[PDB]
Design a binder for this molecule. Structure first.
Ligand SMILES: Nc1ncnc2c1ncn2[C@@H]1O[C@H](COP(=O)(O)OC(=O)[C@@H](N)Cc2ccccc2)[C@@H](O)[C@H]1O
Ligand SMILES: Nc1ncnc2c1ncn2[C@@H]1O[C@H](COP(=O)(O)OC(=O)[C@@H](N)Cc2ccccc2)[C@@H](O)[C@H]1O
Ligand SMILES: [Mn+2]
Lengths: 266, 785, 233, 157
């Protein structure tokens, strides 16, 4: 006979990091809405991160992002069409620059979602990080309206918190969007409004920078008669509320006792 | 259904070509499975007149004297070879379709056969080779090349769906084409009738089986071969011409989906009776088969005085005796509408599938009998010099079709098109509909031949296919889905994630039939299947599987036979049936195991399969435990039940040796669980930051006592501060009581907000010593390391 | 926007045929060679867990899920039901008695055939690229009023493959659905909506896509065959 | 402002633009199923580690770092994994560990890397003694991974 209750061979059992899980669900939610996930580079030029997004230098608007500037020769930063690009290098302060990279390399209409690691120079506490993730959304084409942006967030909220969930839209400022807005979702289980991110209708000047970069590259203009909306939300906070993580610093902490607790979420 | 291009062209003269025809029909809803050219006629085949047929003494052959321009002789053994008919003469030199060598002048039983008269098979126009082709003696000037009156033909093999029984007639097809814009030429039924009484009566004893039944009367018939144009037509459609009258009934049937049969009056007696058949009543059908009828069978019977007899199987096949032959002079023409269900059962009952049963089963135009009588009677007058009565015997009064609703607006709304109202209505009218009204919702009543036109939707499809499905634009819908459709895909996603993890963990997926061999309930030792098949593919698949593992085992064997896998780790997910349909997950382990391929030591068998499963459940974040339990199909020594989150969901163990033997297989390990597995909601636990207290201790216990109880006991008493607890060594030896075991346990304690005092850890091991002894167990180790 | 939901392999004649406007003893039902079942003690659960009765069989297609789903939900919605189906017929190199189908059902106000064509076009694009195209031809199914059969152009192989059938949900299907609802206490939910449905046979698409010559390989269980697909993650 | 959802056939060149992202996520998932545990480490590197870990110095540096230990951008993924093993062994005492991490590395060009770490007694019967571990064990998992991906895998010295 054999003790069938004895532990078997200690084969290893793996797991996915909580941000991977939260990113995966966010991506699945938007995939169901027609969005496709594309990524951008963590090291960007000032042109894509700021200038092309209507965020010029020495202006109050740029203070909304504490940049991490870089130095070093020999580094080749590829642009939207593999062409080598130049400009003061930095660590992207948000995923937004992919809005520009994508649009020069493609034609409307389309729906994309860009997840990604972003960086910001600021002190890290229990609810703040200098290194975190964002999920960008961009939908462009004839007749795209803000009603559609609200429709997207409503679907996001429903998928994330259920039918007793709701979204809230309030005016807020971003150089890359003309109506500008900030949105929150009602979390029933916790009976409170959490601010998810910012969004708005793509600014006129963003489309212009996009087509100007296209012209300077031989491509024909593709965004003169289209509108669109974009949004950007910060993954960690959503993940924290969703997995009951109290300290945002745990994410990059590397502690196995922390990571292991998420194997169950397949 | 065979569609002879030139025949269809007779109704639709403007047809562009067979290819364009195929395209038109496809857009109408009729797919052609094949297109082919069929009547090769060499120059050497000429039309001849049989002046005389002389028997060759001592043989079963005849010497034919033919007028083929010049007189010639040919030897023939065909029973139908006789004076007064036209034949297909293959002159010496002619090369015939299919024949190896040419046709030459040959000496046969004393006579020089100058070529030979042909059968449909030899000429290549039909399968029949039992007799010569029979043409009218004046069909063509003697000696004229046959091809001149018999051009090659292109025939389309059309698929005609159930909903379009009217399309089982070439004229019906032509009407669909007409709607597309083609000119339509309907045959004019020139008839010179006579006001005379019919020398017979009609008695429909079963109006349920024959809702509409008519009888035509044609006399003074001159039975003879059908003209060349008709024989070409019938042969092209896959039918063999017989003669004047018979061919006309087949032709009209193929023209307008209206089976009809000519009954020789000599056998009708006083009248025709459409009635049910009487138990065991015999009937020799047209095919020569002697049959016995069933009381549910509708028959066409005659009667004489007190005599009642079957003449034919109504709507399926006529009787052999009243077939219409050379000496026939008058007939009763049957044109009717039978009950589909009735015809269906009868056809099956006698294993008969005929051009007639097929059409009546699909449905015939309820008010087409009378028009069909004119057509047939008309052709009979023209080809058999028939004399026809002005009156018909008619029973039944079918009601015309009712008006249907029709909103243009809805047609466009449902299709997503924007066809102008006028085009929609012009289309319905070309198809033969009546359109009444002015307002937005018209009153459209379809022609009786359209059994498929009853709902407004039906009418929109008429508009769509006539306009052409290609004219329907492309769009994508947009809408917020109704609230209760939320996360309705969770279950499916849950299972697919499981398969993916399993494939990553190392298991290989397999797909096995849901069928089970009834006999395996025995071979594999398990309750018999609850669901069986009334009509199985084979006795080895007469039941529905109750378990997944049996199939996996049979897969291992089949694999080991074809190829020699040295091992294998498979898995399969599928539906099992037993009181309720449920989803199972089963896995199989076989081979030497896992280890260094160039070395010797290895990890395999039971504990290996248990390793993978523990990894799987660790990966799923679910509690997994295996307690020993007996299972007939498993080895009594290596057998246990599987528990996930404290809930029995399956079994794990080695295949029973006895079963292994009967199947001629080495040891096999496996498991089977019921899906979906339990869901363990997250409950994040903030890991303590303070140091953890380490401490070992072995436990002396009887060999029988399962590790599970020990682990459970130690853990339970270990205290609210127990973090870890692992088994690092099992020893059963001399240092202590014989027949005992020692369990090496690595333990760890830890506190959430502070550190553990050296006393608390002892107070904890104490409970693990008191409750440990209370169970008759002792502890050798008591400190770390 | 479609969500995947599954149905049971063992169905009642009601869902597989009757509710789908396919009555008994009619030519239409010949389009599916059924595998009838026998056996007591088996409990067949309906759309709302209620125990249901009726002659049991092995579903001849996924279509019955159209009915199960609609009684258990409210429009508008988009579903896709994959599943093992069974048919009594001889198995050769390109035919199976056991195979899989993928059903599609989209219902709601204003749903038009233009939307069904739009769906297949997207299917073709995603499956074969931009040089791909779809073809729609009239065909018959009791559960759909325009009825249709669709094919997709496969550039790489330069030929049209017939993928499946589709159409606008028949009026009577919506009626059977709401009638079953009423008989269950639920309010009618499909009187003012339209919709389209489609069903395509997986094996054939897989064969053309993975270059599998013999459809019998799928249920063959041969590891040398199965193993060749580990690469497709 | 009302709520709506847009509808349109996406422009042809947006086709399968998500293949890359999907490809990588499938890889992570397989790795998690094969047995590897995912870890997330900062993209920052300690300039001094180019020495401690023996490797070419980082090509990109930070003008305004958070600290001197994070004044450069990582060139490799493994250094961080090792420092993770150590930090783990200090707080807790993992008897072993099979980790993996995917991330952006910077050196002449930004590129994505996949790194894995193996440590501990190995794999075998927890109540027995014999075991499979170290090099050939890590090579086992990798061979399984590539077998699962359907890719040829070879390791030359
Ligand atoms: N220090 C931090 N730690 C964790 N999350 C942060 C931190 N700073 C911000 N976030 C998250 O980042 C999200 C948005 O970042 P902001 O810097 O506030 O906005 C942006 O980054 C904009 N690019 C978003 C955007 C995109 C498109 C159109 C309009 C607006 C917030 O909702 C928040 O949850
Ligand atoms: N013996 C077989 N082996 C492999 N595939 C088969 C077999 N018989 C059919 N199929 C596949 O099954 C697909 C459709 O099956 P059919 O029986 O022809 O139709 C149906 O089964 C319908 N229920 C489909 C449908 C759904 C919704 C609306 C309209 C029509 C075909 O396109 C074909 O690829
Ligand atoms: Mn129709």
């Amino acid at each position: 006979r054999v003790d069938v209750s004895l532990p078997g061979a200690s084969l290893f059992s793996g797991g996915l990091h909580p941000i991977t899980l939260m990113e995966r669900e966010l991506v699945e939610i938007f995939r169901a809405l027609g969005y496709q996930a594309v990524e951008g580079p963590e090291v960007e030029s000032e042109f894509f991160n700021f200038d092309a997004l209507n965020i010029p230098e020495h202006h109050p608007a740029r203070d909304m992002w504490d940049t991490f500037w870089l130095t070093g020769e020999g580094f080749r930063l590829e642009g939207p069409l593999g062409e080598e690009v130049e400009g003061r290098l930095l660590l992207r302060t948000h995923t937004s620059p992919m809005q520009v990279r994508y649009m020069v390399a493609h034609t409307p209409p389309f729906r994309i979602v860009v997840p990604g690691r972003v960086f910001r120079f600021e002190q890290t506490d229990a609810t703040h990080e200098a290194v975190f993730h964002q999920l960008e959304g961009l939908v462009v084409g004839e007749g795209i309206a803000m009603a559609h942006l609200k429709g997207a967030i409503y679907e996001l909220a429903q998928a994330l918190f259920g039918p007793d969930s709701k979204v809230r839209f309030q005016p807020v400022y971003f150089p890359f969007v003309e109506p500008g807005a900030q949105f929150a979702v009602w979390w029933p289980e916790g009976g409170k409004w959490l601010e998810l991110g910012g969004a708005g209708m793509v600014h006129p000047k963003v489309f212009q920078a996009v087509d100007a970069y296209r012209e300077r590259l031989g491509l024909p203009p593709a965004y003169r008669g289209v509108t669109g909306f974009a949004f950007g939300l910060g993954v960690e906070r959503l993940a924290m509320l969703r997995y009951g993580i109290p300290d945002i610093r745990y994410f990059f902490g590397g502690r196995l006792k922390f990571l292991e607790q998420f194997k169950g979420v397949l | 259904m065979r569609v002879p291009f030139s025949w269809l062209k007779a109704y639709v003269p403007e047809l562009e070509s067979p290819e364009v025809l195929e395209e038109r029909l496809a857009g109408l809803g009729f797919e052609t499975d094949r297109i082919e050219r069929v009547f090769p006629i060499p120059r050497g085949v000429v039309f001849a007149r049989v002046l005389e047929a002389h028997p060759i003494p001592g043989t079963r052959l005849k010497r034919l004297v033919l007028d083929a321009g010049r007189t010639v002789e040919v030897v023939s053994g065909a029973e139908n070879a006789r004076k007064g008919i036209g034949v297909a003469l293959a002159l010496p030199g002619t090369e015939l379709p299919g024949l190896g060598q040419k046709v030459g002048e040959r000496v046969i039983q004393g006579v020089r056969s100058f070529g030979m008269a042909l059968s449909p098979r030899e000429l290549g126009v039909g399968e029949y080779g039992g007799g010569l082709l029979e043409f009218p003696e004046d069909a063509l000037p003697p000696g004229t090349p046959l091809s001149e009156a018999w051009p090659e033909e292109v025939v389309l093999d059309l698929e005609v769906t159930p909903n379009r029984p009217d399309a089982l007639g070439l004229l019906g097809l032509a009407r669909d084409l007409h709607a597309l814009g083609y000119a339509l030429v309907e045959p004019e039924a020139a008839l010179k009738a006579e006001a005379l009484p019919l020398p017979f009566a009609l008695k429909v004893e079963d109006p349920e089986g024959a809702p509409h039944f008519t009888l035509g009367y044609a006399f003074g018939l001159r039975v003879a071969p059908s003209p060349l144009w008709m024989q070409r037509a019938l042969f092209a459609a896959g039918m063999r011409p017989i003669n004047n009258v018979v061919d006309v009934t087949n032709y009209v049937m193929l023209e307008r989906a209206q089976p009809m049969h000519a009954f020789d009056l000599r056998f009708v007696g006083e009248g025709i009776a459409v009635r049910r058949a009487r138990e065991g009543e015999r009937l020799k059908t047209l095919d020569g088969v002697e049959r016995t009828l069933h009381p549910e069978d509708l028959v066409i019977a005659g009667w004489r005085g007190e005599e009642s007899f079957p003449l034919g199987l109504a709507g399926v096949m006529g009787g052999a005796e009243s077939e219409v032959r050379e000496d026939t002079e008058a007939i009763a023409l049957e044109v009717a509408c039978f009950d589909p269900v009735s015809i269906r059962k009868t056809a099956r009952r006698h294993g008969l599938r005929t051009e007639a049963s097929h059409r009546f089963e699909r449905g015939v135009d309820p008010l087409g009998q009378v028009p069909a009588q004119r057509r047939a009677l008309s052709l009979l007058q023209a080809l058999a010099g028939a004399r026809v009565a002005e009156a018909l015997l008619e029973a039944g009064s079918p009601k015309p079709p009712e008006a249907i609703p029709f909103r243009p607006e809805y047609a466009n709304r449902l299709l997503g098109t924007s066809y102008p109202e006028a085009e929609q209505i012009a289309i319905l009218k070309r198809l033969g509909c009546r359109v009444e009204g002015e307002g937005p919702t018209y009153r459209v009543t379809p022609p009786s031949h359209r059994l498929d036109l009853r709902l407004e939707e039906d009418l929109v499809e008429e508009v769509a296919r006539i306009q052409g499905y290609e004219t329907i634009p492309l769009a994508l819908p947009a809408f917020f889905p109704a609230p209760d459709n939320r996360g309705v895909e969770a279950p499916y996603r849950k299972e697919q994630r499981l398969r993916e993890v399993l494939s990553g963990l190392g298991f290989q997926e397999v797909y096995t039939y849901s069928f089970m061999d009834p006999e395996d309930a025995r071979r594999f030792r398990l309750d018999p299947p609850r669901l069986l098949l009334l009509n199985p593919l084979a006795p080895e698949k007469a039941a529905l599987r109750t378990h997944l593992f049996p199939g996996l085992v049979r897969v291992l064997k089949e694999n080991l036979d074809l190829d020699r896998p040295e091992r294998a780790l498979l898995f399969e997910v599928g539906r099992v049936f037993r009181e309720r349909e449920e989803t199972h997950l089963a896995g199989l382990l076989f081979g030497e195991g896992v280890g260094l391929p160039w070395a010797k030591e290895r990890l395999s068998g039971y504990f290996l399969l248990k390793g993978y499963l523990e990894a799987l459940f660790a990966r799923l974040g679910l509690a997994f435990r295996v307690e020993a339990q007996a299972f007939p199909f498993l080895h009594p020594g290596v057998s246990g039940r599987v528990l996930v989150e404290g809930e029995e969901v399956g079994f794990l163990g080695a295949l029973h040796p006895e079963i292994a033997q009967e199947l001629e297989l080495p040891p096999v390990h496996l498991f089977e669980l019921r899906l979906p597995l339990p869901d363990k909601p997250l409950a994040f636990q903030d890991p303590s930051r303070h140091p953890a207290a380490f401490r070992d201790l072995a436990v002396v216990v009887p060999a029988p006592t399962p590790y599970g109880e020990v682990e459970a006991l130690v853990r339970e008493a270990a205290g609210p501060y127990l973090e870890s607890l692992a088994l690092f060594d099992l020893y059963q030896g001399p240092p202590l009581p014989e027949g005992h075991k020692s369990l090496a346990f690595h333990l760890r304690f830890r506190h959430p907000k502070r550190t553990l005092r050296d006393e608390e850890v002892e107070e904890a091991v104490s409970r693990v010593a008191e409750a440990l002894r209370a169970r008759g167990f002792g502890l050798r180790g008591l400190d770390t390391p």
